[PDB]
Design a protein around this ligand. Structure first.
Ligand SMILES: CS(=O)(=O)c1cccc(Oc2cccc(-c3ccnc4c(C(F)(F)F)cccc34)c2)c1
Ligand SMILES: CS(=O)(=O)c1cccc(Oc2cccc(-c3ccnc4c(C(F)(F)F)cccc34)c2)c1
Lengths: 232, 233
């Protein structure tokens, strides 16, 4: 069984995830209309990304352990994990039958909509393949939330000053997920390793994203201030 | 372990040892290391160590059960991606914590400065030695190393794989076997096994860092030999 402390930890992540979701409804009426129209579609997409950044930041603050780290390590961990979490949340919003992604409650986007918004096929196709691979895993809410917490506290991120501390904070989340997947699905021993394998996939996708932001340079496209401070 | 799992592990361990025995034999074949125009000779020496490692990885993979049942194009594609990663996994294995040096082939030892003298960037060398010392903390033996490499080989998300579903299904028994082996080795250290898989996560970053190292060289117009050029640019 999960202990009282572990359940408290899990319920906190699940509940914080859901409250950050209710802060999608607040932003939706204030977003650039989807159509010079090409730049408006890029802006539209960058604003979605910024809504997601705000959500991620506000989630991290709620994750027990995060505010125990120094400010620089808080920044260093969020800078790396932001794209990985975005893609994870993107995968969760994917509809297998329509093959669209649904952002901010409604607003559905196809592969071609991603393209119309200025993104390249070298980046788009891995996103949709990762989206498809994630649906197949069929992660529940506690699984999703715990994977994100584990993702956040990765010690090998660039510019981490206290990787020993970061590694120690990840431990209880690794342990809770191990205990959870043992109780939830006793007859699937490989669920937990399979979940961790997706972090490997996410590192590759992050590298693919860096290439994509580099390609914006020559396309006469610029990241807005808040995205630029993380990705430029 | 089951009879099937233990035979598997023995197969991998014996392939790994036949690979290492060939590493030993190759020492007198290698261009000497020139001491303190002679940059180029150090770079070719290192280049030769990697060529040796490439064909050793090719030979190991053919011994990994199931790998020859994949189409040849996927075999090629799997190896093209994971070679850099298997090299570093092997580098880490030969890292000496006392001396802060790595032992290639039989007794050729190289420090951080030696890596820089052979023509590699600090951006790349630093992480190699950090991963090596990270690897030493988990205290992996021969079976665990051999299993992690086989797991590394069968990653379904590599570029240009035609049957990723088949690749993911061949990775399964290897993951299985490591989980059982690590639960039998340290029954009280649950978190050793997840930490080993996070190493594959670290290896993906390391791979991108290597693509930059190769890119930096293209910018200085200093070339890789055919075999490494084929795989890396
Ligand atoms: C809107 S939401 O429902 O809150 C949500 C949910 C999940 C993810 C999400 O963020 C998005 C949505 C669409 C695109 C991007 C995005 C990711 C990475 N790069 C981008 C870039 C660039 F850097 F140039 F490559 C430009 C424009 C958008 C992006 C992020 C929003
Ligand atoms: C010698 S051995 O015992 O067979 C052995 C053991 C373990 C690993 C191994 O492979 C090596 C050894 C030394 C260097 C490299 C290497 C890796 C990546 N890039 C390289 C590059 C470049 F591309 F320019 F960046 C140039 C030269 C060498 C390398 C690989 C060999």
């Amino acid at each position: 069984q999960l202990t009282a402390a572990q359940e408290l930890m899990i319920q906190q992540l699940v509940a914080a995830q859901l409250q950050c979701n209710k802060r999608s409804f607040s932003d939706q009426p204030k977003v650039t209309p989807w159509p010079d129209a090409r730049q408006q579609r890029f802006a539209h997409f960058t604003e979605l990304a910024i809504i997601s950044v705000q959500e991620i930041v506000d989630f991290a603050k709620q994750v027990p352990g995060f505010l125990q780290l120094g400010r620089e390590d808080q920044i260093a961990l969020l800078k790396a994990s932001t794209i990985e979490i975005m893609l994870l949340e993107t995968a969760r919003r994917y509809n297998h039958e329509t093959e669209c992604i649904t952002f901010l409650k409604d607003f559905t986007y196809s592969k071609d909509d991603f393209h119309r918004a200025g993104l390249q096929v070298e980046f788009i196709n891995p996103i949709f393949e990762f989206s498809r691979a994630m649906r197949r895993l069929g992660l529940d809410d506690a699984e999703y939330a715990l994977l994100i917490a584990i993702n956040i506290f990765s010690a090998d991120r660039p510019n981490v000053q206290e990787p020993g501390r970061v590694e120690a904070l990840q431990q209880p989340y690794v342990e809770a997920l191990l205990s959870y997947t043992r109780i939830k699905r006793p007859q699937d021993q490989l669920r937990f390793p399979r979940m961790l394998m997706k972090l490997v996939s996410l590192r590759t996708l992050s590298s693919v994203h860096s290439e994509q932001v580099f390609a914006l340079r020559l396309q006469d496209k610029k990241l807005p201030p808040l995205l630029s401070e993380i990705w430029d």
